[PDB]
Amino acid sequence: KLEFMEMEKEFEQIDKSGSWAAIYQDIRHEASDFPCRVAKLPKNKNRNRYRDVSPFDHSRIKLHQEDNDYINASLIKMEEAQRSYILTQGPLPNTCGHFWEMVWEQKSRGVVMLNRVMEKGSLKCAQYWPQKEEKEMIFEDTNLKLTLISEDIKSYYTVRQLELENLTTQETREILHFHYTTWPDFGVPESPASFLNFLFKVRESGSLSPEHGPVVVHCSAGIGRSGTFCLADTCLLLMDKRKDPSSVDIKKVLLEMRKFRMGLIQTADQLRFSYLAVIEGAKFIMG
Ligand SMILES: O=P(O)(O)c1cccc(-c2ccc(C[C@@](Cc3ccc(C(F)(F)P(=O)(O)O)cc3)(c3ccccc3)n3nnc4ccccc43)cc2)c1
Ligand SMILES: [Cl-]
């Protein structure tokens, strides 16, 4: 089955004819448009990192808390691939509590962070997890306690073991934190290999299994890097479940995803990268 020699030549083709921008732009202007009335209510202003990025009302995550149920987060549900993800923004100083509250209510087992607390000057994200085992964090508002249990730092990413405790029901759960540290805003990963490696680590940890709630994925705004990550994972699942990998149309898959959250994948290059990553990854799995 040198059927991959076709996908790869197809890639070199698009690459050759410099058609990536066209393909990407076409997707942008075909993407779904849905209302985001809740995100725009005056009371939720300070809960949004960015003015022009909001969760659609139909797929937004609702906090089971009584007061205000809003958080800038979206549930992406892929039927065929049979995987779900929650994409959200880098927590704000006033929303770290809400963030971990969502992780608890949705029963997530993993958190995937693709940005850095500080990016190109000025911290583009709050330090929502403990950096020192001995300095756990307590979130007054949502009444949760979080403790760093251990962490394995590597060259382009860090894996952390955390303990999240609901101080009301006195229950505790182990949350795995996968932080990819070398992915610039509006840029691509250091390399396809690093990316796939980080992704396989997330997969084998079982954090993506249907046993748990959906994995929480975020970057700064929760659309560029987060969209690339999920698009790649989902497309890899489809190439394995389809009797014919070539049948996977990444353009359609992204559009499908864009029905749940606006602007997933922010540059023609990220789209290209996700393609490269999917082919390399498939070749590896089907070995
Ligand atoms: O207007 P539409 O409806 O056609 C539409 C549809 C979909 C997306 C957008 C849409 C797409 C991009 C933006 C850029 C952004 C937020 C944003 C930040 C990082 C990332 C990221 F990619 F790096 P990450 O990886 O973290 O996701 C993605 C988005 C912004 C850009 C640069 C710096 C600060 C803010 N921003 N938000 N509000 C703004 C007001 C004035 C100027 C810039 C603004 C806005 C809307 C617009
Ligand atoms: Cl867009």
Side-chain angles (χ1 to χ4, degrees), residues 78 81-85 112 195-196 198-200 202-204 207-209 215 217 225-240 248 250 253 257 274 277-278 285:
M78 307 298 288
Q82 257 158 166
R83 182 97 87 202
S84 279
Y85 319 83
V112 176
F195 172 84
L196 290 176
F198 174 74
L199 168 63
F200 293 135
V202 183
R203 289 183 156 193
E204 39 186 278
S207 280
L208 303 187
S209 159
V215 63
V217 181
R225 286 162 289 186
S226 290
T228 308
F229 179 84
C230 299
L231 176 65
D233 183 48
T234 293
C235 281
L236 270 166
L237 288 181
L238 295 167
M239 290 195 152
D240 198 6
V248 179
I250 301 191
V253 175
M257 230 166 251
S274 73
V278 162
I285 296 180

mmCIF file of all heavy atoms in Angstrom, residues 78 81-85 112 195-196 198-200 202-204 207-209 215 217 225-240 248 250 253 257 274 277-278 285:
data_model
loop_
_atom_site.group_PDB
_atom_site.id
_atom_site.type_symbol
_atom_site.label_atom_id
_atom_site.label_comp_id
_atom_site.label_asym_id
_atom_site.label_seq_id
_atom_site.Cartn_x
_atom_site.Cartn_y
_atom_site.Cartn_z
ATOM 1 N N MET A 78 -16.765 15.402 17.853
ATOM 2 C CA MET A 78 -16.588 14.797 16.553
ATOM 3 C C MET A 78 -17.223 13.406 16.546
ATOM 4 O O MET A 78 -16.704 12.481 17.183
ATOM 5 C CB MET A 78 -15.091 14.720 16.249
ATOM 6 C CG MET A 78 -14.382 16.060 16.410
ATOM 7 S SD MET A 78 -14.986 17.370 15.280
ATOM 8 C CE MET A 78 -14.290 16.740 13.709
ATOM 9 N N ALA A 81 -14.948 10.365 14.392
ATOM 10 C CA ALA A 81 -13.729 10.117 15.160
ATOM 11 C C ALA A 81 -14.074 9.582 16.563
ATOM 12 O O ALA A 81 -13.309 8.838 17.159
ATOM 13 C CB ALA A 81 -12.912 11.410 15.280
ATOM 14 N N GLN A 82 -15.228 9.977 17.084
ATOM 15 C CA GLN A 82 -15.643 9.517 18.395
ATOM 16 C C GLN A 82 -14.755 10.070 19.483
ATOM 17 O O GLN A 82 -14.291 9.341 20.357
ATOM 18 C CB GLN A 82 -15.621 7.984 18.446
ATOM 19 C CG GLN A 82 -16.994 7.370 18.340
ATOM 20 C CD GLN A 82 -16.955 5.930 17.871
ATOM 21 O OE1 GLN A 82 -17.950 5.211 17.977
ATOM 22 N NE2 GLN A 82 -15.805 5.501 17.332
ATOM 23 N N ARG A 83 -14.515 11.372 19.411
ATOM 24 C CA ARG A 83 -13.699 12.055 20.395
ATOM 25 C C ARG A 83 -14.331 13.411 20.682
ATOM 26 O O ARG A 83 -14.989 13.994 19.814
ATOM 27 C CB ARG A 83 -12.280 12.254 19.867
ATOM 28 C CG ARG A 83 -11.369 12.922 20.889
ATOM 29 C CD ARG A 83 -10.552 11.899 21.628
ATOM 30 N NE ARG A 83 -9.337 11.625 20.882
ATOM 31 C CZ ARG A 83 -8.616 10.519 20.997
ATOM 32 N NH1 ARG A 83 -8.998 9.568 21.833
ATOM 33 N NH2 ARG A 83 -7.507 10.381 20.287
ATOM 34 N N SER A 84 -14.155 13.899 21.898
ATOM 35 C CA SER A 84 -14.672 15.201 22.284
ATOM 36 C C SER A 84 -13.540 15.976 22.935
ATOM 37 O O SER A 84 -12.651 15.372 23.542
ATOM 38 C CB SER A 84 -15.806 15.073 23.297
ATOM 39 O OG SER A 84 -17.025 14.770 22.660
ATOM 40 N N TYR A 85 -13.575 17.304 22.799
ATOM 41 C CA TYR A 85 -12.576 18.163 23.421
ATOM 42 C C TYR A 85 -13.257 19.412 23.876
ATOM 43 O O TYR A 85 -14.275 19.808 23.325
ATOM 44 C CB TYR A 85 -11.493 18.639 22.463
ATOM 45 C CG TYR A 85 -10.958 17.647 21.483
ATOM 46 C CD1 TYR A 85 -11.626 17.386 20.291
ATOM 47 C CD2 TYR A 85 -9.740 17.010 21.715
ATOM 48 C CE1 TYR A 85 -11.091 16.512 19.338
ATOM 49 C CE2 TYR A 85 -9.196 16.138 20.778
ATOM 50 C CZ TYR A 85 -9.876 15.894 19.592
ATOM 51 O OH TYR A 85 -9.335 15.026 18.671
ATOM 52 N N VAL A 112 -4.468 20.229 28.379
ATOM 53 C CA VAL A 112 -3.406 20.385 27.395
ATOM 54 C C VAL A 112 -3.182 21.874 27.165
ATOM 55 O O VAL A 112 -4.061 22.561 26.635
ATOM 56 C CB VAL A 112 -3.794 19.682 26.067
ATOM 57 C CG1 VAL A 112 -2.738 19.927 24.979
ATOM 58 C CG2 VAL A 112 -3.926 18.195 26.297
ATOM 59 N N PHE A 195 5.852 17.532 17.914
ATOM 60 C CA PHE A 195 4.409 17.611 18.041
ATOM 61 C C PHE A 195 3.749 16.238 18.225
ATOM 62 O O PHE A 195 2.954 16.036 19.150
ATOM 63 C CB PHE A 195 3.805 18.313 16.812
ATOM 64 C CG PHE A 195 2.307 18.257 16.781
ATOM 65 C CD1 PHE A 195 1.552 19.194 17.481
ATOM 66 C CD2 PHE A 195 1.656 17.193 16.161
ATOM 67 C CE1 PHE A 195 0.167 19.077 17.579
ATOM 68 C CE2 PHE A 195 0.267 17.058 16.252
ATOM 69 C CZ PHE A 195 -0.483 18.003 16.966
ATOM 70 N N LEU A 196 4.075 15.307 17.336
ATOM 71 C CA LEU A 196 3.491 13.975 17.393
ATOM 72 C C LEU A 196 3.874 13.259 18.684
ATOM 73 O O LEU A 196 3.079 12.508 19.271
ATOM 74 C CB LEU A 196 3.944 13.164 16.178
ATOM 75 C CG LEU A 196 3.350 13.625 14.833
ATOM 76 C CD1 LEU A 196 3.923 12.817 13.671
ATOM 77 C CD2 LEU A 196 1.832 13.476 14.884
ATOM 78 N N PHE A 198 4.542 14.703 21.585
ATOM 79 C CA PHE A 198 3.732 15.288 22.640
ATOM 80 C C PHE A 198 2.318 14.724 22.558
ATOM 81 O O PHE A 198 1.727 14.384 23.572
ATOM 82 C CB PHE A 198 3.695 16.802 22.481
ATOM 83 C CG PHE A 198 2.760 17.497 23.433
ATOM 84 C CD1 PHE A 198 3.088 17.640 24.773
ATOM 85 C CD2 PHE A 198 1.562 18.030 22.983
ATOM 86 C CE1 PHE A 198 2.235 18.310 25.660
ATOM 87 C CE2 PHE A 198 0.695 18.705 23.862
ATOM 88 C CZ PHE A 198 1.028 18.847 25.198
ATOM 89 N N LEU A 199 1.780 14.624 21.343
ATOM 90 C CA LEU A 199 0.423 14.102 21.178
ATOM 91 C C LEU A 199 0.312 12.634 21.614
ATOM 92 O O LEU A 199 -0.642 12.260 22.301
ATOM 93 C CB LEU A 199 -0.053 14.258 19.718
ATOM 94 C CG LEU A 199 -1.330 13.503 19.300
ATOM 95 C CD1 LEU A 199 -2.533 14.009 20.098
ATOM 96 C CD2 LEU A 199 -1.577 13.680 17.810
ATOM 97 N N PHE A 200 1.277 11.798 21.228
ATOM 98 C CA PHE A 200 1.201 10.394 21.629
ATOM 99 C C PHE A 200 1.286 10.268 23.140
ATOM 100 O O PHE A 200 0.622 9.425 23.728
ATOM 101 C CB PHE A 200 2.284 9.561 20.945
ATOM 102 C CG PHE A 200 2.095 9.459 19.457
ATOM 103 C CD1 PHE A 200 3.168 9.623 18.592
ATOM 104 C CD2 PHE A 200 0.819 9.258 18.917
ATOM 105 C CE1 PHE A 200 2.982 9.600 17.204
ATOM 106 C CE2 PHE A 200 0.608 9.235 17.537
ATOM 107 C CZ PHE A 200 1.693 9.408 16.674
ATOM 108 N N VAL A 202 0.106 12.354 25.260
ATOM 109 C CA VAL A 202 -1.230 12.687 25.743
ATOM 110 C C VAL A 202 -2.161 11.480 25.545
ATOM 111 O O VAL A 202 -2.954 11.126 26.428
ATOM 112 C CB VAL A 202 -1.824 13.906 24.979
ATOM 113 C CG1 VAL A 202 -3.178 14.262 25.544
ATOM 114 C CG2 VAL A 202 -0.889 15.102 25.069
ATOM 115 N N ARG A 203 -2.056 10.844 24.385
ATOM 116 C CA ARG A 203 -2.892 9.696 24.094
ATOM 117 C C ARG A 203 -2.637 8.500 25.038
ATOM 118 O O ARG A 203 -3.549 8.020 25.728
ATOM 119 C CB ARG A 203 -2.681 9.262 22.638
ATOM 120 C CG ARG A 203 -3.266 10.228 21.590
ATOM 121 C CD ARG A 203 -3.078 9.693 20.186
ATOM 122 N NE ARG A 203 -4.050 10.237 19.240
ATOM 123 C CZ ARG A 203 -4.258 9.740 18.023
ATOM 124 N NH1 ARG A 203 -3.559 8.690 17.616
ATOM 125 N NH2 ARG A 203 -5.164 10.278 17.213
ATOM 126 N N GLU A 204 -1.402 8.019 25.091
ATOM 127 C CA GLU A 204 -1.151 6.871 25.940
ATOM 128 C C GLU A 204 -1.438 7.075 27.406
ATOM 129 O O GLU A 204 -1.582 6.097 28.127
ATOM 130 C CB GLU A 204 0.262 6.326 25.762
ATOM 131 C CG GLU A 204 1.321 7.350 25.593
ATOM 132 C CD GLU A 204 2.639 6.696 25.292
ATOM 133 O OE1 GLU A 204 3.309 6.255 26.258
ATOM 134 O OE2 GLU A 204 2.988 6.596 24.092
ATOM 135 N N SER A 207 -5.762 10.021 29.040
ATOM 136 C CA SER A 207 -6.522 11.228 29.317
ATOM 137 C C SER A 207 -7.615 11.522 28.273
ATOM 138 O O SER A 207 -8.541 12.288 28.567
ATOM 139 C CB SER A 207 -5.582 12.430 29.416
ATOM 140 O OG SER A 207 -4.947 12.488 30.678
ATOM 141 N N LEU A 208 -7.504 10.929 27.075
ATOM 142 C CA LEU A 208 -8.474 11.132 25.980
ATOM 143 C C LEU A 208 -9.533 10.027 25.882
ATOM 144 O O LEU A 208 -10.408 10.065 25.009
ATOM 145 C CB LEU A 208 -7.759 11.223 24.616
ATOM 146 C CG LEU A 208 -6.667 12.293 24.413
ATOM 147 C CD1 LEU A 208 -6.230 12.315 22.960
ATOM 148 C CD2 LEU A 208 -7.193 13.678 24.836
ATOM 149 N N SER A 209 -9.452 9.039 26.767
ATOM 150 C CA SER A 209 -10.400 7.927 26.770
ATOM 151 C C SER A 209 -11.819 8.394 27.083
ATOM 152 O O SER A 209 -12.009 9.392 27.771
ATOM 153 C CB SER A 209 -9.986 6.876 27.803
ATOM 154 O OG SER A 209 -11.097 6.072 28.149
ATOM 155 N N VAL A 215 -10.992 16.073 27.379
ATOM 156 C CA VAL A 215 -9.741 16.733 27.702
ATOM 157 C C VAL A 215 -9.928 18.251 27.480
ATOM 158 O O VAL A 215 -10.645 18.680 26.564
ATOM 159 C CB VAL A 215 -8.590 16.183 26.785
ATOM 160 C CG1 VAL A 215 -8.878 16.503 25.331
ATOM 161 C CG2 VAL A 215 -7.239 16.773 27.196
ATOM 162 N N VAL A 217 -8.314 21.564 26.354
ATOM 163 C CA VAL A 217 -7.230 22.076 25.526
ATOM 164 C C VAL A 217 -7.275 23.596 25.462
ATOM 165 O O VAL A 217 -8.332 24.183 25.236
ATOM 166 C CB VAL A 217 -7.353 21.561 24.096
ATOM 167 C CG1 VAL A 217 -6.189 22.099 23.243
ATOM 168 C CG2 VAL A 217 -7.391 20.053 24.091
ATOM 169 N N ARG A 225 -3.547 27.533 17.988
ATOM 170 C CA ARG A 225 -2.793 26.347 18.357
ATOM 171 C C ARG A 225 -3.744 25.213 18.832
ATOM 172 O O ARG A 225 -3.555 24.048 18.498
ATOM 173 C CB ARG A 225 -1.798 26.735 19.443
ATOM 174 C CG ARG A 225 -0.607 27.552 18.895
ATOM 175 C CD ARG A 225 0.165 28.330 19.973
ATOM 176 N NE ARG A 225 -0.601 29.462 20.483
ATOM 177 C CZ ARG A 225 -0.125 30.368 21.332
ATOM 178 N NH1 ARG A 225 1.128 30.260 21.774
ATOM 179 N NH2 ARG A 225 -0.880 31.401 21.712
ATOM 180 N N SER A 226 -4.779 25.575 19.584
ATOM 181 C CA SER A 226 -5.724 24.577 20.065
ATOM 182 C C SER A 226 -6.424 23.922 18.897
ATOM 183 O O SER A 226 -6.655 22.702 18.904
ATOM 184 C CB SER A 226 -6.782 25.206 20.992
ATOM 185 O OG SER A 226 -6.215 25.613 22.232
ATOM 186 N N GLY A 227 -6.783 24.734 17.901
ATOM 187 C CA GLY A 227 -7.430 24.185 16.731
ATOM 188 C C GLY A 227 -6.478 23.272 15.967
ATOM 189 O O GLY A 227 -6.884 22.225 15.446
ATOM 190 N N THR A 228 -5.207 23.645 15.876
ATOM 191 C CA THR A 228 -4.263 22.787 15.153
ATOM 192 C C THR A 228 -4.135 21.448 15.871
ATOM 193 O O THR A 228 -4.233 20.402 15.261
ATOM 194 C CB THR A 228 -2.858 23.434 15.064
ATOM 195 O OG1 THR A 228 -2.996 24.761 14.541
ATOM 196 C CG2 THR A 228 -1.938 22.632 14.131
ATOM 197 N N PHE A 229 -3.911 21.489 17.177
ATOM 198 C CA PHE A 229 -3.772 20.268 17.956
ATOM 199 C C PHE A 229 -4.948 19.291 17.753
ATOM 200 O O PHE A 229 -4.753 18.128 17.380
ATOM 201 C CB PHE A 229 -3.663 20.609 19.437
ATOM 202 C CG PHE A 229 -3.547 19.405 20.323
ATOM 203 C CD1 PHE A 229 -2.319 18.800 20.541
ATOM 204 C CD2 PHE A 229 -4.671 18.880 20.944
ATOM 205 C CE1 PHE A 229 -2.198 17.701 21.357
ATOM 206 C CE2 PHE A 229 -4.561 17.764 21.775
ATOM 207 C CZ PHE A 229 -3.310 17.175 21.980
ATOM 208 N N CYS A 230 -6.163 19.763 17.989
ATOM 209 C CA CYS A 230 -7.327 18.903 17.864
ATOM 210 C C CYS A 230 -7.602 18.448 16.453
ATOM 211 O O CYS A 230 -8.019 17.321 16.250
ATOM 212 C CB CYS A 230 -8.563 19.600 18.419
ATOM 213 S SG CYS A 230 -8.349 19.957 20.144
ATOM 214 N N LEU A 231 -7.385 19.319 15.477
ATOM 215 C CA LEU A 231 -7.609 18.917 14.110
ATOM 216 C C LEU A 231 -6.690 17.739 13.791
ATOM 217 O O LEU A 231 -7.119 16.763 13.176
ATOM 218 C CB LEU A 231 -7.312 20.056 13.129
ATOM 219 C CG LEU A 231 -7.447 19.592 11.669
ATOM 220 C CD1 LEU A 231 -8.919 19.208 11.337
ATOM 221 C CD2 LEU A 231 -6.959 20.709 10.741
ATOM 222 N N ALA A 232 -5.423 17.848 14.197
ATOM 223 C CA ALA A 232 -4.466 16.786 13.934
ATOM 224 C C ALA A 232 -4.884 15.459 14.604
ATOM 225 O O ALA A 232 -4.928 14.415 13.961
ATOM 226 C CB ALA A 232 -3.083 17.210 14.413
ATOM 227 N N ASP A 233 -5.210 15.515 15.888
ATOM 228 C CA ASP A 233 -5.599 14.313 16.611
ATOM 229 C C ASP A 233 -6.792 13.638 15.938
ATOM 230 O O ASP A 233 -6.758 12.450 15.616
ATOM 231 C CB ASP A 233 -5.939 14.655 18.064
ATOM 232 C CG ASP A 233 -6.296 13.416 18.893
ATOM 233 O OD1 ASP A 233 -5.546 12.415 18.836
ATOM 234 O OD2 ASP A 233 -7.320 13.446 19.607
ATOM 235 N N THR A 234 -7.843 14.414 15.723
ATOM 236 C CA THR A 234 -9.036 13.902 15.085
ATOM 237 C C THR A 234 -8.724 13.322 13.707
ATOM 238 O O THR A 234 -9.172 12.221 13.384
ATOM 239 C CB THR A 234 -10.124 15.008 15.002
ATOM 240 O OG1 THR A 234 -10.567 15.318 16.323
ATOM 241 C CG2 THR A 234 -11.345 14.550 14.187
ATOM 242 N N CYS A 235 -7.935 14.018 12.896
ATOM 243 C CA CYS A 235 -7.647 13.477 11.577
ATOM 244 C C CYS A 235 -6.838 12.185 11.632
ATOM 245 O O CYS A 235 -6.953 11.327 10.739
ATOM 246 C CB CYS A 235 -6.954 14.523 10.704
ATOM 247 S SG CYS A 235 -8.109 15.746 9.993
ATOM 248 N N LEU A 236 -6.020 12.030 12.675
ATOM 249 C CA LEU A 236 -5.240 10.793 12.817
ATOM 250 C C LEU A 236 -6.191 9.651 13.154
ATOM 251 O O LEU A 236 -6.055 8.561 12.614
ATOM 252 C CB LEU A 236 -4.170 10.922 13.906
ATOM 253 C CG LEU A 236 -2.853 11.432 13.351
ATOM 254 C CD1 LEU A 236 -1.955 11.855 14.482
ATOM 255 C CD2 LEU A 236 -2.197 10.352 12.496
ATOM 256 N N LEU A 237 -7.159 9.910 14.032
ATOM 257 C CA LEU A 237 -8.142 8.893 14.395
ATOM 258 C C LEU A 237 -8.901 8.426 13.158
ATOM 259 O O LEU A 237 -9.091 7.224 12.958
ATOM 260 C CB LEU A 237 -9.150 9.434 15.415
ATOM 261 C CG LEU A 237 -8.665 9.666 16.849
ATOM 262 C CD1 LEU A 237 -9.805 10.190 17.712
ATOM 263 C CD2 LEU A 237 -8.121 8.352 17.424
ATOM 264 N N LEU A 238 -9.338 9.372 12.325
ATOM 265 C CA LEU A 238 -10.076 9.010 11.122
ATOM 266 C C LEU A 238 -9.251 8.185 10.135
ATOM 267 O O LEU A 238 -9.767 7.248 9.534
ATOM 268 C CB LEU A 238 -10.607 10.260 10.424
ATOM 269 C CG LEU A 238 -11.656 11.048 11.210
ATOM 270 C CD1 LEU A 238 -11.864 12.415 10.555
ATOM 271 C CD2 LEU A 238 -12.968 10.264 11.279
ATOM 272 N N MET A 239 -7.981 8.520 9.945
ATOM 273 C CA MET A 239 -7.177 7.739 9.008
ATOM 274 C C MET A 239 -7.011 6.282 9.460
ATOM 275 O O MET A 239 -6.749 5.400 8.651
ATOM 276 C CB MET A 239 -5.799 8.366 8.812
ATOM 277 C CG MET A 239 -5.832 9.658 8.063
ATOM 278 S SD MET A 239 -4.227 10.164 7.485
ATOM 279 C CE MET A 239 -4.726 11.136 5.984
ATOM 280 N N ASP A 240 -7.196 6.034 10.749
ATOM 281 C CA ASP A 240 -7.039 4.697 11.302
ATOM 282 C C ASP A 240 -8.357 3.931 11.265
ATOM 283 O O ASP A 240 -8.370 2.705 11.158
ATOM 284 C CB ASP A 240 -6.546 4.808 12.750
ATOM 285 C CG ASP A 240 -5.945 3.517 13.270
ATOM 286 O OD1 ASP A 240 -5.797 2.552 12.483
ATOM 287 O OD2 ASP A 240 -5.614 3.477 14.473
ATOM 288 N N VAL A 248 -9.863 10.857 4.109
ATOM 289 C CA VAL A 248 -9.898 11.911 5.116
ATOM 290 C C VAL A 248 -9.676 13.266 4.444
ATOM 291 O O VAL A 248 -8.601 13.525 3.895
ATOM 292 C CB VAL A 248 -8.812 11.696 6.176
ATOM 293 C CG1 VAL A 248 -8.855 12.829 7.207
ATOM 294 C CG2 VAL A 248 -9.018 10.352 6.849
ATOM 295 N N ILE A 250 -9.183 16.874 5.240
ATOM 296 C CA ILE A 250 -8.893 17.811 6.324
ATOM 297 C C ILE A 250 -9.697 19.115 6.272
ATOM 298 O O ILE A 250 -10.034 19.687 7.309
ATOM 299 C CB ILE A 250 -7.375 18.112 6.385
ATOM 300 C CG1 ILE A 250 -6.627 16.789 6.599
ATOM 301 C CG2 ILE A 250 -7.057 19.089 7.512
ATOM 302 C CD1 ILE A 250 -5.144 16.920 6.938
ATOM 303 N N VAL A 253 -13.053 18.293 7.731
ATOM 304 C CA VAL A 253 -12.924 18.077 9.168
ATOM 305 C C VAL A 253 -12.807 19.400 9.926
ATOM 306 O O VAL A 253 -13.467 19.597 10.950
ATOM 307 C CB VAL A 253 -11.704 17.147 9.482
ATOM 308 C CG1 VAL A 253 -11.504 17.028 10.982
ATOM 309 C CG2 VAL A 253 -11.950 15.760 8.906
ATOM 310 N N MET A 257 -15.329 21.030 12.732
ATOM 311 C CA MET A 257 -14.882 21.551 14.030
ATOM 312 C C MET A 257 -15.267 23.022 14.207
ATOM 313 O O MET A 257 -15.701 23.453 15.295
ATOM 314 C CB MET A 257 -13.367 21.402 14.141
ATOM 315 C CG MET A 257 -12.901 20.748 15.428
ATOM 316 S SD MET A 257 -11.140 20.200 15.389
ATOM 317 C CE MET A 257 -11.311 18.427 15.343
ATOM 318 N N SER A 274 -0.528 20.993 10.230
ATOM 319 C CA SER A 274 -1.421 19.957 10.716
ATOM 320 C C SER A 274 -1.512 18.814 9.697
ATOM 321 O O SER A 274 -1.624 17.643 10.067
ATOM 322 C CB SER A 274 -2.803 20.553 11.014
ATOM 323 O OG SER A 274 -3.488 20.843 9.813
ATOM 324 N N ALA A 277 1.802 16.860 9.916
ATOM 325 C CA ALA A 277 1.754 16.092 11.140
ATOM 326 C C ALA A 277 0.827 14.866 11.019
ATOM 327 O O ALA A 277 1.133 13.782 11.538
ATOM 328 C CB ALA A 277 1.306 16.990 12.274
ATOM 329 N N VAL A 278 -0.298 15.031 10.339
ATOM 330 C CA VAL A 278 -1.218 13.914 10.170
ATOM 331 C C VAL A 278 -0.645 12.814 9.278
ATOM 332 O O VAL A 278 -0.786 11.635 9.578
ATOM 333 C CB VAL A 278 -2.572 14.375 9.594
ATOM 334 C CG1 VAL A 278 -3.350 13.187 9.024
ATOM 335 C CG2 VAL A 278 -3.382 15.054 10.705
ATOM 336 N N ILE A 285 1.825 5.113 12.745
ATOM 337 C CA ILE A 285 0.854 4.207 13.359
ATOM 338 C C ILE A 285 0.575 2.968 12.507
ATOM 339 O O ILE A 285 0.436 1.869 13.042
ATOM 340 C CB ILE A 285 -0.501 4.905 13.627
ATOM 341 C CG1 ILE A 285 -0.333 6.026 14.650
ATOM 342 C CG2 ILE A 285 -1.514 3.896 14.162
ATOM 343 C CD1 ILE A 285 -1.637 6.753 14.946
#
